[PDB]
Amino acid sequence: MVNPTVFFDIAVDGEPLGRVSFELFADKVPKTAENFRALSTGEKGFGYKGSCFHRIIPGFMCQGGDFTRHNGTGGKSIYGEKFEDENFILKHTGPGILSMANAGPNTNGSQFFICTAKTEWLDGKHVVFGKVKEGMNIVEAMERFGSRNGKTSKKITIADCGQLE
Amino acid sequence: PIVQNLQGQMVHQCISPRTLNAWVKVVEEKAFSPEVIPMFSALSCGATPQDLNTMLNTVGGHQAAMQMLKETINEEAAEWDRLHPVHAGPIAPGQMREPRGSDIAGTTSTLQEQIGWMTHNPPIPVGEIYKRWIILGLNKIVRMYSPTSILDIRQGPKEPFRDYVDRFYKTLRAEQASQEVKNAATETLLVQNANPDCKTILKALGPGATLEEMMTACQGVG
Amino acid sequence: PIVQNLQGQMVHQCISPRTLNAWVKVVEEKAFSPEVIPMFSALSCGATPQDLNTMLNTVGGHQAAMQMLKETINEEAAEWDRLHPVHAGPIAPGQMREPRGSDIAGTTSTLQEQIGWMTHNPPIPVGEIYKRWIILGLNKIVRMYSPTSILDIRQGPKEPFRDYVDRFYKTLRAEQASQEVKNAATETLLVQNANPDCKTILKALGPGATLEEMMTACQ
Amino acid sequence: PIVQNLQGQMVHQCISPRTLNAWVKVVEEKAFSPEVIPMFSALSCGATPQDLNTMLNTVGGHQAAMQMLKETINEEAAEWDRLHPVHAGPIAPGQMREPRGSDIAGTTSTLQEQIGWMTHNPPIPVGEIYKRWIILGLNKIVRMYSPTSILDIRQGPKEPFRDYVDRFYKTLRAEQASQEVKNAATETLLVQNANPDCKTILKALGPGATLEEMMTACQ
Amino acid sequence: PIVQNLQGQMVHQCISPRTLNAWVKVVEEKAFSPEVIPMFSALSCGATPQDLNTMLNTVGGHQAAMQMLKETINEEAAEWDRLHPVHAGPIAPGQMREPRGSDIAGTTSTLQEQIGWMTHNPPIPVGEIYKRWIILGLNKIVRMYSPTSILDIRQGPKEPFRDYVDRFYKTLRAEQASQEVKNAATETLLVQNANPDCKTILKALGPGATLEEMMTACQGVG
Amino acid sequence: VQLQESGGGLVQAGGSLRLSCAASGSISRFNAMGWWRQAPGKEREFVARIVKGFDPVLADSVKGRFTISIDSAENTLALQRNRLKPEDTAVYYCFAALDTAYWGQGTQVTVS
Amino acid sequence: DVQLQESGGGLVQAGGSLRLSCAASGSISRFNAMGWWRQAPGKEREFVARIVKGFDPVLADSVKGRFTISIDSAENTLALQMNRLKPEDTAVYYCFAALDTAYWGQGTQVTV
C-alpha cells in the first residue's frame, strides 16, 4: 500500500548533470525497495553517494552501485549481500524501469540498472523494483558518455541520494 | 571434445567409445601409478568440461581418491572466483556470461555454454583450465598412493642391477619432488642401498661414474 | 544419432556397432552399479529416441529393472502430456506436429518425426528429454540394487583406512549418486564407523579436516 | 547400405566387416534370445534387401530357423503381391519398374534396382519393407525357442525375489516377443508362482502395486 | 576396391587390413562350410580383380581346393573368350583395349586397366564377372567337402529334435540341389530318419504338419 | 521378536481416531508395513500400506480421507482416520513386512 | 612407546606472549599428525591447532588472529606461540600426536 520515492543527483567529472527521481514500487517488492532506500540514504552507515556507473550501454541500460569494488565485481545488500529474488511478477516494459542486477538467480546485491529501452529478454531474470518519475532526459544524457562495451568516456558519479517527499 | 572439422570451423564431437573404455581400463590395470596422469592428459585432448567429468565419473572404484579429487577441484574453483570474480550486470543480447569457478568445472554450466566459451574469439579455454585442476588433484593422489619410500628401496641379493635402478626411479617419479632432489638422492641412496656385490663394483668405478657406466659395470652380478 | 557433416548440417547417422556392443558389455560386466549411469549418458550422445530404445532393448538380462524403467518412463510421459498438452488441429503444409509423451519415448513417433523435432529451429530436443527420463529411471534401479546400507559399512579392526573409505563412498554413491546431501552424513558416520584407534585419531584432528588430512593421519 | 554422404546426396556403401562379424557373433553367443531382434534391427540400419539377405545368409547354424524364416518371407511376399499387384506395361525410358514381392526380398532384383527404389522421390523403401518381414519371422522363432512356459516359472524357496522376477519377465518377453498386454498375466501369475513366504507378503500388499514397491517389500 | 568418394567420382581404395584378416580367419575357422560363400561376396564388395586374387592368395592351407578353384576359373575364362572374342586392331588414342578372359581374372591386366574398365561409361564390370566365376568355383568345393549325405543323417536317441533338424538342413545347404529337391526330401527323409520317440509323435500329428508344428510337438523328447 | 496390535476403541460418526501397532525392536527395520481389517460377513479388506522410500498408499475406499505415519521411536504404525464413517466398523489387523509376512492380533472398531 | 609432556603454561597479563611447547620422545617426523586442544574447568575441550604431515598448519578461528603454531624438528617440540592473550583464553592446553593410535599429553594451565 506504500510507494515511496528516491532521488539521485548525478555528476560528470565533478560537473553537475541533473537530478533523477524514481518511484519505488514497495507495494509489490518492499524488501527489494527497502534495501535500495537504505542504501540510498546511507542510514546503515554505507550507501550510493560517491559510487560510479561502471557500465553505461546506449540503447540498453545504465548500471552502477558497486560501492565495495567499484568495477562491477561485487555489490552488497543490507543483509550482507545475500538477498533473494523477491519476485518476477513485474515485467521490463520500457524506458525508466529500475531493476536489480544479478550475476545469477538469487545473487542480487547493491547494483541496479536503469533501462533506456524495452528489454524483454531480461523479463523473469531480473527484479523490477522501481521506475523513473522525472529526469529521464538526464538518464539519456548519461548514455552519451558510454560505449558499446560499457566503458564510460568520463567518470559518472552519484553526488547525492535520499528519500523524496 | 572440440575438433577442427574439415573446414576451419571448430565443432563439438561426442566422446568416443574407444577413449572411454581405454580410460576405464588404464585405471583398472594401473590404478594411480604415476604414468596414468600423462595418459589422462592425452585421452582428454580437446575435452569439454562435460567430457572430463564423464571420464572421471565412469571410474567405479577408488572412490576415496575420487572424493579426494573432488575436494581439490573445489579448492581450485574457489581460488578461480577470487582471482577472476564475475562482473555482475544485465547480459547484452548475444554476449556470453562470465564463467565462474563452478562453470569451469562443468557443474553449473551447459554444454552449449562450454562450447561458447571455448569457441569465442579470443577463446576462454574452460576445458584446459579444468584439466589443469584435475591433473593437480591426480598428482596428489599418486603421491599418497606411492607404496614405498625410496629410503626403503634397497637392492635384493639376486636382483639384477637394472631392476633395482628401475624400482628406484619409479619410486622417485611417484614422490615427484624435484630435479635437484632427484639428482642429490641418486648421488646418495642408489649406491648405499645397492647390493654388496654391486656396491663393491660401484665403489671401484670411482667418482663421476655415469648412470650408464654403472648399469653396464653391474651387468655381471645377475 | 544426430551429428553434423562438413557443411555443418545436422544429419542422422546410424548407431555404430562399437557403441551398441560397448553398452551391452558394460551392463554385463558392471550391471547397475552407479558408475554405469555416466557411461550410458556418454554412449547416447546425440541419440535419437529410437536409438535410446534400441540401446535399452538390446539388454538381455535384468528384465525386472527394465520393466521398472518402463514404468518410470510412462510416469514421466504422463506428466509431460499434462504440462505440455498437444494442441489439436489440421497440420499446415510444411509444419510439424507437436510431440506427445509417447512421441518423446519413441513408441508412437517415426524416425523422420524425431529428426524433424531435433533439427528444427528452434530445436525441440526429444532425444535429450527422453534421455533425462531414462537416467531418472536408472538412478532408481542403482538404489534398489545397492547391496548394503551405509550404516552397515564399518571399518574392520585390521582394515586399512584407505580401503574402508573406498567401501564407504561406493555404498554412498549407489544410494542415488553423490551429492552435497551425502556430505552431512559423511562428516559423521565415516568417523563413527571407523575402528577404535583410528576414531581417536580422527576425533583429535578436529573439525573441518580434509580427506587428505584424515587419510594421512590414520596411515 | 544406403547412407547420406558429406554432400546431401544418398549413396550406397559396402556392408562393413565390423557389422557382419557382429551379427554372426551375437547369433552364435546369444542364439534367438528375444534381445537379438533389436540387435538385428540396429545392425541393419539403412540396409538394402541384398544386405539383409547377406546378414541372414552368413549365419552358419540354426538352419531349421532359417528355413522357417524363408517360409514366413514367402508368405509375406504373396500378401504384398495381392495388395499391391504389379501394373503391367512397357517401361518408359528412364522410369523404374514396379517392385514385386520377390524384388523386395532381393531374389529377383539387382542392387541398382534396389538403390533406385530406395532413393526415388517418392522413395519406395524396399529395404524397410523386407526388414519388417524378417522381424515378423524372427519373432516366431524367438517364441518357439522360449525354453519355458510362463506357467512353469515359480520362485524357489532360496531364490531372491529379484532373481525370480528377472526370470519371469524374460520368459514373458520370449512369449509373443513382448508386444502384448503384459498386464493381465502380471496381476495374477507373478504372485501365484511366488514362493510361499513371499506369496503371503505379496498377498498382503493390497490392490495396486508398483514393481518397485513389491520388490522392496520382499527384500 | 572401387568406392564412391565424397564427390560423385569413383576412385580406387586399398583393400583394408580388417577385411583381409577377416577373410583369412573365416577360412581358418569355417573352412569351406557353405556359409563362407556369402561372407566372401560381402567382403569382396567393389573389389578389383587384383583385390579378389589377393584375398584368395592369402589363404595358406586348403591348397587342393585352391588349385581346383584355379581350374574352374580357367574353364570360365575360356568360355568368356569364346562368347566375347577380342576385336583385334590398332588402338585409338585414349580408347580402352578389350578385356580377355585372362584380363578379367587379373592375370594379364594391370590395376590401371582394371580401374579403366570398371569406371568407363558404360562400365565393363570385370570385377563383378570374376567374382561370379570364383563363387561358381567355391560352390563346387563346398559340395565336394560336405562330409555326410542326408541319407546318413539320422536323429540320435538323446538328440533334441531341433538339433537333428538343424543338421538335416545344413547338409541340404552344402548339397544345395534345388528347392524342389529340398521340399521333396523333407516330406520323406526327415520323418523316416527321426528318432522312434519323435517318430511316433510326428506320425500322430497327421498329414500337412508344418515344420514349425513338428519342432514344437517334439520339444518334449529331450 | 514379537508383534502386538493396539489402539482400538469406540467413537461416534463424524469423529476422528488414530490406530497404533506395537512391534518388538525398531519398526524402521521392516521393509514394508500396513493395515488390514475383517468385518463380520464381509471379506478381509486391505486398509493401509507404507513402503520404505516411497510415499504412503492407502486403500481407495479410504484413500482420500485417512493418513498414515510411522515413528520408529515408538515402534508404531499411526493410521490416522479422518472424516470417519460407520462403514469402518470391523476387526482390524496390522501387518509389517520384513523378509520372514507378519500380522497383528486385531482390534474391534465400531463407529456410531 | 611415544611420550609427550607440555610445559610453559602459567598466569600472565593480557596482551603478553607465550610459547607452549610439547616435548615428544623420538623424532617428530615419525608422527603422522600433531596438534593442540584445550579444556578449562567448566568449558568443553576445545580444538586449538593442528599440523598434519605435508600440509599447512590449521588453527581455530577463535585463536586464528592471535595464535601461531610452529614445529621445530631440531628441538623435537611442538610450539604454539600465543600473543595478545585474553582472559577468555584461560584453559588447560593439551598436545596430541598420531602414530598407530592417538597419544595425548597431560596438559598445561593457562590463566590470563
Automatic annotation (TrEMBL), chains C, D:
It is a lipid-anchor. GO terms for biological process: viral translational frameshifting. ATP binds at R18. Disulfide bonds join C198-C218. GO terms for cellular component: host cell nucleus; host cell plasma membrane; host multivesicular body; viral nucleocapsid; virion membrane. GO terms for molecular function: ATP binding; RNA binding; structural molecule activity; zinc ion binding. Coiled coil: none annotated. It is found in: Host cell membrane; Host endosome, Host multivesicular body; Virion membrane; Virion. Its main location: host cell. Keywords: ATP-binding, Capsid protein, Host cell membrane, Host cytoplasm, Host endosome, Host membrane, Host nucleus, Host-virus interaction, Lipoprotein, Membrane, Metal-binding, Myristate, Nucleotide-binding, Phosphoprotein, Repeat, RNA-binding, Viral nucleoprotein, Viral release from host cell, Virion, Zinc, Zinc-finger. This is Gag polyprotein. It comes from Human immunodeficiency virus type 1 (HIV-1). The chain holds residues 133 to 351 of 403 of the full protein.
